[model samples]
Target chain A: GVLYVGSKTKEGVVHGVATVAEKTKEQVTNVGGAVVTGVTAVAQKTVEGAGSIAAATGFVKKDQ
Target chain B: GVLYVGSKTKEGVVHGVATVAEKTKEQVTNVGGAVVTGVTAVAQKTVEGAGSIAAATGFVKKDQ
Candidate 1:
């Protein structure tokens, strides 16, 4: 499983990429949560005053 | 299966960037599994405490 999360800021841009190795192992052993193998993220942006804030996102997973 | 893993601490660092393609397919592969097609690594200076340890990493995938 793969976890992808991305976020933008007022300063510039900040993104992240994480996996389900140790973090997943810890959660499964300590919290009894479903073994997470992927990730997801959200971003926040503001349109100045009268501008249209446009956001485009896409999602894809393996087919095999 | 594309799997990317990374970890950092206060001592000697160990990093990894991987992909999933026929290790002999072409000259480049996405950065997610053990199917890396190209790679290069080195080291430099830092400024933390007793000989700081500064590390920078990067990876990339593709769209089809």
Candidate 2:
């Protein structure tokens, strides 16, 4: 629920975007999960982008 | 599978530590995920700790 890491390195892209996101049970642990990204550059695949969320999507959790 | 984030900030700990890890479908995106951490100071819950792995673990993967 806690503990996380968001990186945007050597990642893929989606529609010309190597986007990312994340969170934890506590709250928004991270957003746009990324530090160093871009390999294919195109939202290749969502690796770690989640956590207990409160609706409002993204590897986040629902605090609501 | 690709895009991802690993944060170690504001995370719970394990046995007395806030640990984290992450990766992507491409490979090791991050070894430990965290920037700011510790609210309760204990492995509260495991949020984002994964990625395409082979055997190894910890928000990480096994490229073996």
Candidate 3:
């Protein structure tokens, strides 16, 4: 009960004086996860572009 | 034929004297893409972690 009270008090204070609106954990997690997917897509394109450059430069076998 | 010849000649020269044991276009592309994804994932996690710390510090609303 004491620990619960302490936790509630801390949460109360945090909400009472926050400078910006706090995001829910779920919201934050979603953005973080989506960004990972976005990054993966961008990286995939970059690799494709790099490969073209490499081939044009004769850095690898044509069949490769 | 002349243009093709010239292109082939350049490719031959590049392959003939590459210093780093040139990688195939596919290999280089894949690595480059993966690194980009890795970097983005790292950045996303950092922002999420920063937000949590900020919330603990009363920087944002608990409901934000």
Candidate 4:
């Protein structure tokens, strides 16, 4: 009676924790991708702005 | 007999999968931090270059 129930409980507990961990890992990966994409886009804009400023001030020619 | 053996097997499998997921999440987090740091440094350098170019061209006076 009690022994049989204890074995079943161990299995249930392990399965639940494993399931949660798997889902959390998926979320972490998704967030990582978003962060990389966002940062890359911002960096691209900054570089472009610098180029424009340089040209407007005569520091860099249009053809250059 | 067989029932008890099956329950132990379930626990072992779940524990292994959970351990791997935890380690993977930690690695992803570390990589994300590095990417953010690198992008920020690059953006800062670009902005500094724009400022210097503006100053040199006299479009922005040092005293102003």
Candidate 5:
């Protein structure tokens, strides 16, 4: 469903461009896994920004 | 999802951060039914970082 991003995750950048033929079928079996994988990446950055701004302002003290 | 988040009145705390994160996953996982369901979330008090939430898969449309 998200083959637009397949270029980055599942199909492996270069592979997706050349292997564009197999894009439609092969990865369909493992699609759901990619979103969450990439999604976690987003969350990390999110927490960092939140913490960064919050900390600059003396916010969120975890183990400190 | 944010009923409890609005109560985050403590210097952007870990407690509040954790709580809000919890609901996000719940809604995200349940977003299984609709693609457009979990698509639009970041429309609040921020933007300078630029699509801070969907930055990774940010290969779409424009930034106006």
Candidate 6:
């Protein structure tokens, strides 16, 4: 599939990614599918003591 | 549902785009909706030979 790429901003976190993620999550969940997310890994950065991390959930569909 | 993708980063990866795509894909599928992506032709001269490419999926929702 072709990938549509957008522009990024100065924000530490990509606003577009967050916005789209939230929107898409709601959309997919509306019909009748289950959205699952998991922590990919955890790490201890210099500033933060301990942090938990996870990989984004993959999207799967049955009906088009 | 509508289609949404995030922005790309200098790392040659679009954080927001990837994030939204992953998130939204799961959301729409839950409600029995479908999200499909198709490949898009691409080319590069400064990069390398036989460089790979593709397009992101479009989003469709059930509820407003």
Best by TM-score: 6
**lDDT to native, each model:** 0.26, 0.26, 0.17, 0.26, 0.21, 0.30
lDDT of each residue in B1-64, candidate 5, tens digit only: 2123223122211111111122222223321111221121111222234224323221222233
Using TM-score, rank the candidates from best to worst: 6, 1, 5, 4, 3, 2
Candidate 5 matches the true fold with a TM-score of: 0.17
lDDT of each residue in A13-44, candidate 2, tens digit only:
22222233233233233343422321221122
Interface RMSD of each: 20.8, 21.5, 30.8, 23.1, 21.9, 17.7
TM-score of each: 0.17, 0.12, 0.13, 0.15, 0.17, 0.17
Docking class of 3: incorrect
TM-score of 1: 0.17
**What is candidate 4's CA lDDT for residue B42?**
16
lDDT of 1 by residue, B3-64 (tens): 43452222222234333223232232233432211233222222233322122122122325
Chain B TM-score in each of the candidates? 0.22, 0.13, 0.12, 0.11, 0.17, 0.18
Instruction: Please name the candidate that would achieve the greatest DockQ relative to the true structure.
Output: 6
As for TM-score, the candidate ahead, 1 or 4, is 1
Residues B1-64, candidate 3, lDDT per residue (tens digit)?
A: 1122212111111111111212212211221111111111100111122212211110111131
Q: Which stretches of candidate 2 lie over 4 Å from their true place?
A: A1-31, A34-64, B1-33, B43-64
Better of 1 and 2 by DockQ: 2
Please give, as one word, the docking class of candidate 2: incorrect
Per-residue alpha-carbon lDDT of candidate 3 for residues A1-64, written as tens digits (9 for 90 to 100): 1222222111111111112212312111221111121111110111122213211111112231
Angstrom error at residue B29, model 6 = 11
Query: Which lDDT value does model 2 have at A10?
Result: 31
CA lDDT for candidate 6: 0.30
Per residue, candidate 6 scores C-alpha lDDT tens digits across B1-64 of: 4322796443222233322334344323344433443211211112222311111123332232
Query: Where does candidate 4 stray beyond 4 Å?
Result: A1-22, A26-64, B1-24, B28-33, B37-64
In model 5, the runs with Cα more than 4 Å from the true position are A1-29, A32-64, B1-9, B16-48, B54-64
| Shift of residue A55 alpha carbon in model 2, Å | 22
- Compare the candidates by lDDT and give the number of the best one: 6
Real A-B contacts recovered, model 5: 0.00
Instruction: Please tell me what DockQ candidate 2 reaches.
Output: 0.05
